[PDB]
């Protein structure tokens, strides 16, 4: 069994494209949420809040030919992955084309523009909108495929498109591929592009927030006055690497991946089950050979829905006790496929800073949520050696990831 | 490390829903390809050929409440999987809800009706078409999620939606989950529903056959006069089980899964590279600790495209040498997400019968294709102890599966 480390990290968020910039907005206490005037034209849509990425740097070599098979979600993904590879010192490295480097990546869906082209045939009886890149741009593994083609990867392609667990499932499966000796380097993460149709699927479940006139005070994970989630977009990426390989080249190491757990509720497509969420955390603890006491901080899923926040916090409290916990969805909204990767990236940053971010707009802890050490109001300084990051998605898919500090 | 066996198998195809019925149609030389008058309405669509499933049995208990989150692709998947579990003796078994049983499944896309609802907002702004099951039915992991909910699975959900490799990647990942001790039973396979938009994706690549007036003569894998693929639909499913668990209950064993290789071309998004296809077969041989000499028969991907058949057959010849080979896409067309699972199922049946099916309509072997033992005209009787089944998809995703006979 091989040990697995994180040697590169990057993300694209509504709060910025570097951890320094994002943590500066964390301290300022401002979220990426805003009212969406462009969504007034959808009359049945009750929510009008989102966390878009207004801009992100696109290097000039991402030209017309390079990006022909990329919609927004795939372009954000590949640009994010290039920054993470550059961070790791592996951009243009021989290992990328060796067969020993691969990718795990997912999103809830491909590009909605390309989905519209594919659907225009069943409606308008016309093939004129479908073109040579419609499927590449629309398909749910558009990010992973565009990455192997762009970087020339010849190892494993692991498509972990599983809605809200896409990015955490990617990290876990990439970790396993290196742990079991199949690969030496993996690009791992998730991404999602924003669309009003994406908001609609949660709006028809009455899971969205209605506070359209107060974008600055919603979503409110675990808050007694929360009224649903707000969706966002972005991308997150970790570069995972076999430990001896990383040490041999003198690489900087951000964290060690020591546990991954995943299981399934087996009950309902949308309503989570507390008991199985907690079992997933126990699977990760067992995979890491650590106990609840050894976990210093938990990054919750914490979507700000009613029964989602209750099920998660009760299970976390049952398995881990009175642990420090917070949700970054208070800042970004629910970034869907991206969330597990963005949350793992920024939680590793918290561990390396010794500074753990509170849940924004958590003012009164809901009495129906589990007894946890909710970080509120201001960042909490902790000497944390081991952290846990949890995510839960439609179909009852659960993931739990455990990361450990590395001193070099 | 655990051994992994196949204890249940099922599929739904244009040639029938039992192995006996399908093999009767093999012997008669009758494909499932037909002319599609219902596609005349799409004027820009050049191909008018497909391999639809006209009917399959749906048990009574699949009522409207049970199937409200299933489109056609998911219903075929769940029905197929129930039949496979029945075959294995595990339907309703306590292990299914124990946490030790899971699912690996994929398709190229979810239900096209649901994709249309999702695009009603993108196109006509009218939201009266999105409902509470639109995403569950449209999403590319609709089969896997519907199966965990329907059967009460609490183990791993492994979404392997990777276009043409969905079903083979599901078998391989399910096999690894058992081999590495994470699960004791896995439902594994793939599925696809037929749609004109799916044909158009290949039509615009000039990859489809235009022999619309001769459906009984096309597709023609490896044939000197082939002119592209024809798409089909269906589902395939294997029940994989840890070997000691199967033996302890006296289960019938159809095969042992002994090797899985997967890699990526890293060069082109639609045109496969021969060298990496061969490396993928080498990965499978190494995983199985067998040599080229030990492979008795190869079930080709064999889509009947110009460049695809040459790259695949040249790779096979280079890495395996002169081997018996045939393509079942000559009977079903290219069933996309289903193809790797249907082809694994029926190849295991060939092994158990000692009778290996010829490529239909392969009348003049292309001298540009590799030097192989192409089975033509009549089935070949073989005392085959080990077989290989290969699949290659968009994004240059390659899979190779090795199965071994089990004498009980």
Author numbering:
A (entry chain B), B (entry chain A): 1 to 408
Give the authors' words:
Aryl polyenes (APE) are one of the most widespread secondary metabolites among gram-negative bacteria. APE biosynthesis gene clusters harbor two ketosynthases (KSs): the heterodimeric KS-chain length factor complex, ApeO-ApeC, and the homodimeric ketoacyl-acyl carrier protein synthase I (FabB)-like KS, ApeR.
The crystal structure contained four molecules of AbApeR in the asymmetric unit. AbApeR was a homodimeric protein with twofold symmetry, and there were two homodimers in the crystal structure. AbApeR and E. coli KAS I protein (EcFabB) were remarkably similar. The proteins shared an amino acid sequence identity of 39% and the proteins could be superposed with an r. m. s. d. of 0.886 Å. The cavity of AbApeR was symmetrical and connected between the homodimeric partners, forming an elongated, narrow canal across the dimer. The residues lining the cavity of AbApeR were moderately hydrophobic. The volume of the cavity was 120 Å3, which was considerably similar to that of the AbApeO-AbApeC heterodimer. Mutagenesis at Tyr135 in the active site cavity of ApeR reduces the activity significantly, which suggests that the stacking of the aryl group between Tyr135 and Phe202 is important for substrate recognition. In the model of 3EN-AbApeR, the narrow binding site of 3EN moiety led to a dead end with approximately the length of three-double-bond polyene.
